[PDB]
């Protein structure tokens, strides 16, 4: 026998009603006790007969009304049940509740018809989704994107989502705001993108140590190649995570390798933080430099040399860095830093931006093949529109620059979208040439001198020659040093210059290492304005001829001079095993300057086709190459398992922090077996490997949680996006995951870490006043360990509220707190 009592759910548990943490969604599906198509015969449902909630329950009558009209005007009209555009067009929130429901019940008969006709609940589901977008309060737009399509919410405490409550979530505790005592200042904000991890929670801080220890012992712990272990870190988003963790990493690295005393041990376990805010240098300096500061000089370099229009004066290569090189003749004073011409984020900014120019802010279909073709094309032209001008000159500056650990971009040596290392860039010959010159000649003090608003001479005086007047200590002193002349005006008048090479280089012969020509660069003097060898006068002054050139390699002038020698030479300074200062980890000096970093990836690095093309395998094959190039320290891509749907599959979208790929399931870069082998190939050639460690976010966690949220600016303070705002809302965010990796390995090394190094777990963190807590392992990430998430494209009106004001609820399984309460139309 039949009746409408059967719209009732078959059971008020999770087996028949969709719920997240006990709560219901208007996008949710449930199993009624029965359905009907005509009104007369009602059929019991099978456990496979599931129907969307938005057919039976609505946020308000206004919405019930729009659900009815939308469905009718989209294929679900039937006049034999009184449903045509004509029968629904006058209905409104003012209509009798008793009438509207009869109309809704009749629509439901028609929906059952379409399901029968189509033999599936697909077009229904696709219609529910399309319907929802029409409704302001129910749509993704209710979560209030900003005008650029960006935004974040914060996770807060709430009586309904109390399992997601935290005592911590200290936000934007970065840099000089580790104590939360200058929120208004120069810190660096909490939220980038993704599900933001609360690195202020003591338990999280313990998990970060666990992680770091696994990574520093990767090959061993995983039973892969046992010499396949990382030596250090590149810290992603370091300005955007509670600075406690940077303290804590420092401490682990000091405990494990004894770095404070020994520059040799410090220098063999290099770490560098991504983050250029000058406040960051201050912080690092005040802390004794546990990591290397990221210097801003690449930005200067692109601004002075790289632009087509609007080029900043040449003097800025002198002062536009955390190090002033007007005349830098001292050691252990500079902030220990790493610098570059290009990084992964600059190259992406440019390719995106080309994407929106070539397609009017449109649907982002993958015409990034189009942007990349345009880049390669502009790259080769003299009169470039986008791509950096003067790329050889920028590396000339960087590789001659004292008091930095320079970082080379894979993409500046190779065509980054072709298969890994398959295609050398046009800039390969220049750069590699300058890299090899560095090992052989670049040492001693530095003087950068203006000779025009557009011309500069950067001279290094050679190993063991501290400044212009020094005689020379080292036996390489005489035959080392370098002049790098850079002009940034292609119209510069032909002219003679003088370059003071220092008193250590009176009456000395100088090879034309690299000079500009009509077509580009010559490596042997052919076609330049200067001969292959020149000699200094009795005062050590070099006379050189320079002019403006304009071709794909140079828009300005570039020339490099190094001493003539008969032999290979290496001016690298070994570090001693007791430091000029016991308060310091890293020190900016000859030893640290002898290091050189290589970024071994690009975000637009293509998926490997075969196993032979795994970057890890190709890296293990060319270890000696990097070594030959004077590279000492290999920055490797985040090797973690990624979100399936990610744009670039590049490493920053982390889904498992411990799964670095297996034989059948590699990252873009390869399997973890293969990772270990590359690492050990590098070691075998005397190089060191650092891992990109991503403590800031995870992206693609599959498990939804009901959490309570407040539309917030990117510092975790509530914001008032175009008039509107919202606080204390229920939100069904994706917050939970980790992979088997987080489960197998999460917290596993903490007892070993406590036994060997107890100070880690007694040292009170600055932001919390409380030491990392190793007594709870994290085997799965969830909201309780997260500050919030970037906007997730779901909307804020999904949570079902009963007419009386309370959210609908189910005592389900783990969900057993309060008393069950379902809508009228489901019981
Ligand atoms: O395409 C083959 C080619 O892949 C490599 O390049 C890949 C890259 O390194 C890797 O990161 C990946 O990135 C994405 C991936 O593109 C996504 O598809 C996604 O992967 C999930 C995927 O959606 C699912 O299909 C599923 O994948 C696997 C099983 O779990 C595997 O065990 C495997 O089983 C066998 C299969 O049945 C056979 O037909 C045969 O292929 O042999 C397999 C055993 O070796 O394949 C199924 C699918 O058939 O689960 C995946 C999640 O783990 O998410 C990844 C990011 O998370 O995709 C790149 C290519 O698009 C690699 O370089 C080449 O060597 C390789 O031959
Ligand atoms: Na953060």
Residues 6+ apart with CB under 8 A from 110: 71, 76, 77, 78, 81, 83
Which residues 6+ apart lie within 8 Å of 112 measured at CB? 35, 36, 37
Indicate whether residue 667 lines ligand 1 (CB < 6 A): yes
> Is the beta carbon of 611 within 6 A of some atom in ligand 1?
yes
Residues composing the chain: 827
Alpha carbon distance, N-terminus to C-terminus of the chain: 18
Ligand nearest to the CA of 741: 1
DSSP 576: P
Within 13 Å of residue 214, how many CA atoms lie on the same side as its CB?
Answer: 24
Structure tokens at 259: 């770095």
From ligand 1's centre to the CA of 609, what distance in Å? Answer: 11
Closest residue by CA, ligand 1 atom 32: 664
Verify whether ligand 1 is closer than 6 Å to residue 664 (CB atom): yes
Q: Which atom of ligand 1 is nearest to the CA of 665?
A: 53
- Of 304, 383, 382, 391, nearest to 347 (Cα)? 391
Cα 611 to Cα 667: distance, rounded to the nearest angstrom: 11
Residue closest by Cα to atom 53 of ligand 1: 665
- Is residue 355 within 8 Å of 348, Cβ to Cβ? no
Q: Which ligand is nearest to the Cα of residue 420, counting in written order?
A: 1
Q: Is 649 in the pocket of ligand 1 (CB under 6 A)?
A: yes
Q: How far is the CA of 611 from the centre of ligand 1 (A)?
A: 12
As given in the structure block, the two tokens for residue 388 are 């950096």
CA of residue 667 to ligand 1 center, whole Å: 9
Residues in contact with 503: Cβ distance below 8 Å, sequence separation at least 6, in sequence order: 468, 469, 470, 471, 539, 540
Q: Which CATH superfamily is domain 314-338+389-594 in?
A: Glucansucrase (3.20.20.470)
CA distances from 235 to 113, 541, 611, 725 (A): 58, 44, 29, 34
Q: Is the CB of 642 under 6 A from ligand 1?
A: yes
Q: Among 6, 30, 4, which residue's Cα sits nearest to residue 800?
A: 30
Q: Is the dihedral of CA 750, 756, 761, 766 positive or negative?
A: negative
Do the strands 337-340 and 521-522 form a parallel or antiparallel pair, or are they unpaired? unpaired
Does residue 608's CB lie within 6 angstroms of at least one atom of ligand 1? yes
Q: Determine the Cα–Cα distance for residues 511 and 523; give it in Å rounded to an integer.
A: 10
Among candidate residues 393, 270, 257, the one with its CA nearest the CA of residue 337: 270
The CA–CA distances, whole Å, from 105 to 108, 347, 825 equal 5, 57, 11
Closest-lying ligand 1 atom to the alpha carbon of residue 644: 54
| 8 Å CB contact between 522 and 483 | no
Helix H segments across 135-243?
202-216, 218-221
What are the domain boundaries of the chain? 4-139+810-826, 314-338+389-594, 343-387
Task: Say how far apart CA 695 and CA 206 lie, in whole Å.
Answer: 12
Cβ(677) to ligand 1 under 6 A?
no
The answer to whether the CB of 450 falls within 8 A of the CB of 318 is yes
Nearest to 212 by CA among 803, 795, 752: 752
| Tokens encoding 468 | 């212009």
Is any atom of ligand 1 closer than 6 Å to the C-beta of 666?
yes
- DSSP of 675-692: HHHHHHHHHHTT-EEEEE
Report how far Cα 468 is from the mean position of its chain's Cα atoms: 42
Cα 666 to middle of ligand 1, angstroms: 8
Residues 6+ apart with CB under 8 A from 661: 639, 641, 667, 669, 670, 671, 672, 674, 675
Which one, of 264, 275, 272, 230, lies nearest residue 407 by Cα? 272
Cβ–Cβ contacts within 10 Å for residue 8, how many?
A: 17
Ion ligand 2 residues within 5 Å by Cβ: 190, 196, 240-241, 696
DSSP string for 308-325: SSSPPPTTHHHHSSSS--
| CA–CA gap between residue 717 and residue 190 (Å, rounded) | 10
Does 653 contact ligand 1 (Cβ within 6 A)? Answer: no
DSSP annotation of 456 reads: E
Query: With contact defined as beta carbons under 8 Å apart, do 558 and 396 qualify?
Result: yes
The closest-lying atom of ligand 1 relative to the alpha carbon of residue 669 is 9
Q: Is 644 in the pocket of ligand 1 (CB under 6 A)?
A: yes
- 671 ligand 1 Cβ < 6 A: no
Q: What is the DSSP string of 126-158?
A: HHHHHHHHH-GGGSGGGG---TTS--EEEEE--
**Rounded distance, CA 540 to CA 501, Å?**
5
Q: How does 163-199 read in b/e, with b if 16+ C-beta sit within 10 Å?
A: ebbbebbbbbbbbbbbeeeeeeebbbbbbbbbbbbbb
At 516, which helix (H) or strand (E)? Answer: strand 509-516
Looking at residue 814, what DSSP letter applies?
S
Q: Report residue 14 as tokens.
A: 């999770």
- Cα-to-centroid distance, 196 and ligand 2 (Å): 5
Q: What is the CA radius of gyration of the chain?
A: 32
Which residues are paired to 408 by β-bridges?
A: 598
* List of residues 6+ apart from 349 with CB closer than 8 A: none
Give the ligand whose atoms come closest to the C-alpha of residue 665. 1
Nearest CA owner, ligand 1 atom 45: 664
Phi and psi at 243, nearest 5°, equal -60, -10
Q: Are strands 641-642 and 521-522 parallel, antiparallel or unpaired?
A: unpaired
Distance of alpha carbon 479 from alpha carbon 516, whole angstroms: 24
- Spatial separation of the C-alpha atoms in residues 529 and 280, rounded to whole Å: 44
Cα dihedral across residues 210, 229, 408, 400: positive or negative: positive
In whole angstroms, how far apart are CA 685 and each of 113, 406, 621, 636, 688? 71, 20, 11, 16, 9
Spacing, Cα 633 to ligand 1 middle (Å): 31
For a pocket test of ligand 1, which of 660, 662, 664, 672 has the largest count of ligand atoms closer than 8 A to its C-beta? 664
Q: How far is it, in rounded angstroms, from Cα 244 to Cα 203?
A: 12
Task: Burial-class residue 140 by CB neighbours within 10 Å (0-12, 13-18, 19+).
Answer: middle
Contacts of 373 (CB under 8 A, 6+ apart): none
């Amino acid at each position: 026998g039949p009746g409408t009592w059967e719209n009732m759910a078959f059971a008020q548990d999770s087996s028949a009603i969709n719920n997240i943490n006990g709560y219901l969604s208007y996008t949710g599906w449930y199993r009624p006790y029965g359905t009907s198509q005509d009104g007369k015969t009602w059929y019991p449902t099978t456990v496979a007969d599931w129907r969307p909630i938005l057919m039976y329950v609505w946020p308000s009558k206004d919405v019930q009304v729009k659900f009815i009209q939308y469905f009718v005007n989209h294929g679900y009209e039937n006049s034999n049940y009184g449903l045509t555009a004509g029968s629904v067009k006058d209905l409104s929130e003012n209509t009798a509740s008793i009438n509207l429901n009869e109309v809704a019940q009749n629509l439901r008969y028609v929906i059952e018809q379409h399901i029968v006709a189509a033999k599936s609940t697909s077009q229904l589901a696709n219609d529910i989704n399309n319907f929802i977008t029409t409704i302001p309060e129910l749509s993704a737009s209710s979560e209030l994107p900003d005008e650029s399509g960006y935004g974040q919410v914060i996770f807060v405490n709430n009586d309904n989502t109390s399992y997601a409550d935290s005592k911590y979530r200290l936000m934007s505790r970065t840099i000089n705001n580790q104590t939360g005592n200058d929120n208004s200042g120069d810190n660096g904000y909490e939220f980038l993108t993704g599900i933001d991890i609360d690195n202020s929670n003591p338990v999280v801080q313990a998990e970060n140590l666990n992680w770091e220890y696994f990574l520093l012992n990767y090959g061993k712990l995983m039973g892969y190649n046992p010499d396949g272990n990382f030596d250090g870190f590149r810290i992603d988003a370091a300005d955007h995570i509670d600075a406690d963790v940077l303290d804590q990493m420092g401490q682990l690295m000091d405990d494990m390798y004894h770095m404070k005393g020994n520059p040799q041990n410090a220098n063999n376990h290099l770490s560098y933080n991504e983050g250029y805010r000058s406040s960051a240098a201050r912080m690092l300096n005040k802390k004794g430099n546990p990591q290397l500061y990221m210097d801003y000089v690449g930005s200067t370099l692109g601004n002075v040399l790289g632009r087509a229009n609007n080029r900043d004066t040449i003097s800025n290569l002198i002062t536009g860095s955390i190090v002033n090189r007007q005349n830098d003749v001292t050691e252990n004073e500079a902030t220990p830093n790493w610098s570059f011409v290009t990084n992964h984020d600059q190259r992406a900014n440019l390719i995106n931006g080309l994407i929106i120019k070539d397609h009017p802010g449109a649907y982002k279909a993958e015409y990034a093949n189009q942007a990349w073709q345009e880049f390669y094309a502009d790259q080769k032209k003299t009169d470039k529109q986008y791509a950096q001008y003067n790329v050889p000159a920028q590396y000339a500056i960087l590789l001659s620059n004292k008091d930095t650990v320079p970082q080379i971009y894979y993409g500046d040596l190779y065509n980054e979208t072709a298969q890994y290392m398959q295609e050398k860039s046009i800039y390969y010959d220049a750069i590699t040439t300058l890299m090899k010159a560095r090992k052989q000649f670049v040492s001693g003090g530095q003087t950068m001198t203006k000779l025009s608003d557009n011309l500069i001479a950067s001279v290094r005086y050679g190993k063991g020659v501290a400044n212009a007047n020094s005689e020379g200590t080292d036996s390489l002193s005489r035959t080392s040093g370098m002049a790098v002349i850079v002009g940034n005006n292609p119209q510069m008048a032909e002219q003679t210059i003088s370059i003071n090479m220092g008193r250590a280089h009176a009456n000395e012969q100088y090879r034309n290492l690299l000079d500009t020509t009509d077509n580009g660069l010559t490596y042997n003097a052919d076609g330049a304005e200067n001969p292959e060898t020149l000699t200094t006068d009795d005062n050590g002054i070099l006379k050189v001829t320079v002019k403006g050139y304009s071709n794909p390699y140079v828009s300005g002038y570039l020339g490099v001079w190094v001493p003539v020698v008969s032999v290979n030479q290496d001016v690298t300074t070994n570090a001693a095993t007791v430091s000029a200062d016991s308060n310091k980890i890293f020190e900016s000096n000859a030893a640290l300057d002898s290091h050189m970093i290589y970024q071994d990836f690009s975000l637009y690095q293509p998926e490997p086709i075969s196993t032979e093309n795994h970057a890890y395998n190709i890296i293990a094959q060319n270890a000696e190459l990097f070594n030959n190039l004077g590279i000492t320290d290999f920055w490797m891509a985040p090797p973690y398992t990624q979100y399936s749907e990610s744009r670039y599959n590049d490493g920053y979208s982390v889904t498992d922090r411990y799964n670095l790929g297996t034989n059948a399931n590699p990252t873009k870069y390869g399997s973890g077996e293969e990772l270990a082998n590359a690492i050990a190939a590098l070691h075998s050639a005397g190089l060191k490997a650092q891992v990109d460690i991503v403590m800031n976010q995870m992206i693609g966690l599959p498990g939804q949680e009901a959490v309570t949220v407040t539309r917030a600016d990117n510092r975790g303070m509530q914001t008032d996006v175009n008039g509107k705002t919202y606080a204390n809302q229920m939100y069904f965010a994706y917050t939970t995951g980790g992979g088997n990796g987080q489960e197998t390995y999460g917290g596993k090394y903490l007892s070993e870490l406590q036994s060997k190094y107890p100070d880690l777990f007694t040292t009170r963190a600055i932001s919390t006043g409380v030491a990392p807590d190793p007594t709870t392992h994290i085997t799965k990430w969830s909201a309780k360990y997260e500050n919030g998430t970037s906007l997730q494209n779901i909307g804020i009106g999904l949570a079902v509220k009963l007419p009386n004001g309370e959210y609908a609820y189910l005592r389900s399984s783990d969900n057993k707190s309060f008393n069950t309460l379902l809508p009228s139309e489901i019981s």
